[PDB]
Amino acid sequence: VSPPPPIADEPLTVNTGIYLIECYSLDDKAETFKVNAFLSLSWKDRRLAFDPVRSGVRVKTYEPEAIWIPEIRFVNVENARDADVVDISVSPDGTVQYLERFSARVLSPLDFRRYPFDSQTLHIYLIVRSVDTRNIVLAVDLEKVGKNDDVFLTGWDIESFTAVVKPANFALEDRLESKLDYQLRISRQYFSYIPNIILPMLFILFISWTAFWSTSYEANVTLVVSTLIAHIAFNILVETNLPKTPYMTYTGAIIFMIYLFYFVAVIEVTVQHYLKVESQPARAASITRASRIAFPVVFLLANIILAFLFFG
Amino acid sequence: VSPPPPIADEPLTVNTGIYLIECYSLDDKAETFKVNAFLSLSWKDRRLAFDPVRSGVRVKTYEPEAIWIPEIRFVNVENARDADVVDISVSPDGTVQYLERFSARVLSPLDFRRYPFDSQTLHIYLIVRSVDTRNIVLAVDLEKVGKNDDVFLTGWDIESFTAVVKPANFALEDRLESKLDYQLRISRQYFSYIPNIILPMLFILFISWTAFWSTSYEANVTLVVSTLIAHIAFNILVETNLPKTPYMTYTGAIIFMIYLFYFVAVIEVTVQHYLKVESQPARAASITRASRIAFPVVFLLANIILAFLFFG
Amino acid sequence: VSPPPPIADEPLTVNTGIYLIECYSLDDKAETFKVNAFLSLSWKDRRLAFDPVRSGVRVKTYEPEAIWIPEIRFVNVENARDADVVDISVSPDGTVQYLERFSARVLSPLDFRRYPFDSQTLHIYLIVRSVDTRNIVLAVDLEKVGKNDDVFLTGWDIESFTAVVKPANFALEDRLESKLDYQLRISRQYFSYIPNIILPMLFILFISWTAFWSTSYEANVTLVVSTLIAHIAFNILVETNLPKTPYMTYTGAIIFMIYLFYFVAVIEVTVQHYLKVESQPARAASITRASRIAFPVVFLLANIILAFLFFG
Amino acid sequence: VSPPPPIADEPLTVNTGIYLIECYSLDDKAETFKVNAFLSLSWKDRRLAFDPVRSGVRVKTYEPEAIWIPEIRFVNVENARDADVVDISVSPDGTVQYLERFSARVLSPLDFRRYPFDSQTLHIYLIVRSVDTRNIVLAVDLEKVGKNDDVFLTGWDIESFTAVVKPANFALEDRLESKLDYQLRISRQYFSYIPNIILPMLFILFISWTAFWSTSYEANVTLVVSTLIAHIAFNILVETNLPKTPYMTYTGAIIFMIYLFYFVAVIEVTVQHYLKVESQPARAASITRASRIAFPVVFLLANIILAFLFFG
Amino acid sequence: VSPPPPIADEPLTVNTGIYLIECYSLDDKAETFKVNAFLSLSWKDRRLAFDPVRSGVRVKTYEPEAIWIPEIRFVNVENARDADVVDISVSPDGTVQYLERFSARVLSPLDFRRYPFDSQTLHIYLIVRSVDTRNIVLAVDLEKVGKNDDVFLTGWDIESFTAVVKPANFALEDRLESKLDYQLRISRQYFSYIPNIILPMLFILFISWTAFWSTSYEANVTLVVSTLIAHIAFNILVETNLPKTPYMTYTGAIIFMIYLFYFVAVIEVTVQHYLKVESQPARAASITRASRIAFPVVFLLANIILAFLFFG
Ligand SMILES: [Cl-]
Ligand SMILES: [Cl-]
Ligand SMILES: [Cl-]
């Protein structure tokens, strides 16, 4: 009904804590995920002190109405959280214990520079706005922060869930506010990507490379163009999931390199046929024999260079 | 309004029960399903005891307000359930009968190691938190647990719906809680998968294999590469439904094996043509006649080995 | 406020009636549909009688939440209906007149054994739970059941909308309930399926068959395999709309028959080429001449047999 | 409050009017579309003098819970509209003015015959609730009805916005005595559809038709069959724009005719090759020379006939 | 409570201000985006004037229902905003400071011409309800308006966020002529588009154009038609991210020109083969040498003309 008046000027410290229950629906395109957890609060209020001997009880229970509760809201959320108070208890000295279960959808950017083998950090921000009669700051209760063992994200491994102890005090709208930061660290499960994506593309490229052992123009044209169509289909399948980014990713570079290799192979086949028609088989044979070794070596060198550029 | 005081130290026992009406919308990728069922509660409150002879009634009817109802919550739900109270009846001795109907969306992990022929178990968890003056524990009333005869799931067969009698008692947030487990066991209907997926792939593979009785290079290239394109299309269609898993499944292994077989067939065709160009027809004929027998036997052996590995 | 007391022991009879307005969003995959209709009720309450000569000039109209209203619920609904009362009135003798409007999503199983030419029946259930002091049973008012001339589904033909007069009673949750059944009978409009699906498949099959008049191996391979690819694409397009069933459907049987025919055609072409290359042209010519007539007659006989099996 | 008392047996002529603001999200699969528009009811309330003092010439401003607002309902809506009152200004003379913004999802039939060149109409039905006072009849005020002239509905250009007074077609037990019908004429901008769809198919068809100037049977087969595959792929591409319509359409008829023409072209190629290999080159030359003129003329005549059939 | 009387004859000036917090969910079909921001208002009054003689420098926090607060509504929002009144403070001089956090989705038109390199402007319109007692003048406080500099609108980079004053220009207006316009300017990030789309199309087109250096009719036909199929597949890939735009676009014009070029190439190949068969190799060689130069130059000139036409 009214914030607790201070002694002279001291700030009011609120101890927080989040305990995860469920996290799910991590969207790569929209960069959002859904959470379901607890929220714990604690502060000091001398107006609610009591005598245990005379009252005969050691703990009091209050309804959320007719009692002062600080307004704490999240920053990076789509809407207000769906809250329902669980318990409120008061110690004889005046300490208030608060508990609540909520659910919300959080906004957090992602980095896809190493998309198949990347790790991400997810942030949840809590903020409290100071009242004009009292300054309020936040604190972290490390004993009440954690997660259940049944929590799971489909396709991700959860590593740690911590909080930054130092709040960030800044002045906004002619008022001072404090902000905490909870970080959830995850890594992507990349096992399924290898046999489903990587190896078939290598097989198709190797199949297309068999045009350097034949001298029939029509068969080479058929092989190369059909393998190109298959590559286009696989590119459609791959890009159906990865969103557009303003920077260069590993997978996009690999795909562009494959396209360039297909173009160069078509050029080589055309040159060989054109030379063969002119009754100059020696040059065509030399070019074909050179290309047979040239293509895989350059492919492996380029792959090594890209792997060092993006991961080293 | 206030929990019933204990006699000396006995905990409060609450008897539960869930009766299924409708279960539907099982999503494989999201690993969720929706429910619609009854919830029943019963406990003892001596403060509401009366004498049935004088009062003229054997059962008193109360509203949800002005009576203490324990807080029962589901653990693995995305949002708090939508429920409406049906009836509350009070026995003369003090036993309270409670009933409601709810609907909720449940999160449950799934196992896809035998995806076409797999069986799943779905879990529903009920929890209760102890108040500062009384401890509450849960119990199972076997006479009020069951499912309707009209319950159906699209694509699944429902086998049983039971509950583990023994609850789990543990401490969370400096309070004691009790949790129950309700298990729904289902198995997938795999009839539609055979003629829609399995047989056409075998037919396409045999059409690909038919190229060992020919000697024209262009025809062999056309057959093998076009069958590869058809296999790619079928693989994309299949993968559009099965989600990504951190382990290896049966279908993925089969698909990878088919890709490997196609690659080996392309290699064999190229080798035969190259040998025939160099004026060594006998070696090409021997290789072709050997491959004619080699391919199906190896395919059958690999299928048997995989079947034993995944199901035995 | 309270159920009317019985005279000696008789139950209470409530007569209902549903007037349809809109039915739409009939989904084959989810087996659900949305409805939009009115609802009318009536019952006898001797505690509300009055004398029209003196109590007032006439009878008037009132607002909701004014009189004891029986609570009726739908059984097969995903969520509780969204309603809004529109009118209510009382009779001089004591009987009460009630009305409202609702909208709900209904779950109902479907049968696809004759998918192109199938007819379905949709069920809607109303139930009432008896209170401990009075028994309530449901009745059908035939004069208030019907559908608007503006009721229409997209692609379906509505035939009738009746209600089974006889209710079904059973003891559920230690109480007696009465249930009513409303049946909506519809039929599918199959004309659009002929030129969109059926005829292109026949044209492609005939194009595949046209290869029995040529002796060039490469041309036959091209024709047959490319037509197979086209069939695969068309089949994917078709199957992207028909859900999986534990039984066999007409369309699936036809598609599997088409696949088998393609396999046999490939085998015949390979056999003809193999016989031709071994200096036995007469046998290949005889086989081709026989197949020219063999294929269409077998196709027609198989189609007739399937048509008799699935509709006889 | 209470509705105005009767004075001189004059019916309350509630003059309605809909001021469109936003029409958007036209969904065709369910015949649903949202509308964000204004409203204005201008009934006469002279008797309930709202401070007609001359010195109080200022227009009296009221809140929703200040005066009697008539209760009107929509018939073809999903759920109740979101009534957001803007302002209720009443002049001291007695004339009232009302303004609100509502959002609703409207069920209106959509006809997709003549799909590229269709002019659709949208219907909104209003009904007012009866009151204890004299009969309430809905009336149309031409100054109130209008639109913002800044509609963001892309793909359509709005012709006009009018209204027609009609009776109801429901259970008319001296109720539903006035149902207003509003009509929103719209037309589809068809210019982009020509380059987006029509011309590429004609180019593909002509590419197929180039085979009548060639003699190579393999080249003709490759041309026609690969052109058919391209046509199927382009149909797949087209299907993403059109809605799912279970009835005959001009575009579908065009597609079917294109399939038929492909079939006839394949037949002609086969006949030409058969005659040429049976050594009657004169007849083959005559047929292939006649086809060059026969095909385009028949195609154009069929197009003209179909256009006349489908456009009166 | 009522607005302060115009004793000083001063129309009430209410300085506004919006501070963006989160912007997300930009939609290209419904033309809708969601926002989270602060609504800061600062008007003046004569009542609630205090003196620091006794109370000192004391900020007086009042209740949302105790004092008068002006009513402000958005013009182009789907539903009303979700208000969370944060703080109300009154200065002894009479200045009243009001703050609120809201969430709402905004309707704003989009122009998708010059699609890969386009810019957009998002508009928010604020209006204030008028009262008879005194006028309300809306101003802009340049210190309150701003953004969080950490907005994660994916796919775009934000340029600026300012405001201006415009008249309402509404046909139903009475006294609202002080609307405000908040303009958010964004630009699409087009870097990934080049390697993802543009270069593969050029490679495919050049592979198609390699057919002017050959004389094999079958090889030329295979090259051109397979390249056309690949182009159709790549158009299918491109259509996934392209908005469904019912008017002309730069990308659409480019794609149409590509189709036209494919058609012309097919015609040229047919002409060359016809001349070679009719024994005019000089003319055939002249045409095939001219085409090698003609095609790229005409393509570049058409690209330049189209770019000038679409980009001023
Ligand atoms: Cl919040
Ligand atoms: Cl719950
Ligand atoms: Cl209900």
Short mmCIF file of C-alpha atoms and ligand atoms in Angstrom, two decimals, chain A residues 73-74 80-81, ligand 1:
data_model
loop_
_atom_site.label_atom_id
_atom_site.label_comp_id
_atom_site.label_asym_id
_atom_site.label_seq_id
_atom_site.Cartn_x
_atom_site.Cartn_y
_atom_site.Cartn_z
CA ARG A 73 9.14 -6.79 -14.71
CA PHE A 74 11.18 -8.41 -17.46
CA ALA A 80 3.64 -9.53 -19.43
CA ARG A 81 4.34 -12.79 -17.62
CL CL F 1 6.80 -8.98 -16.85
#
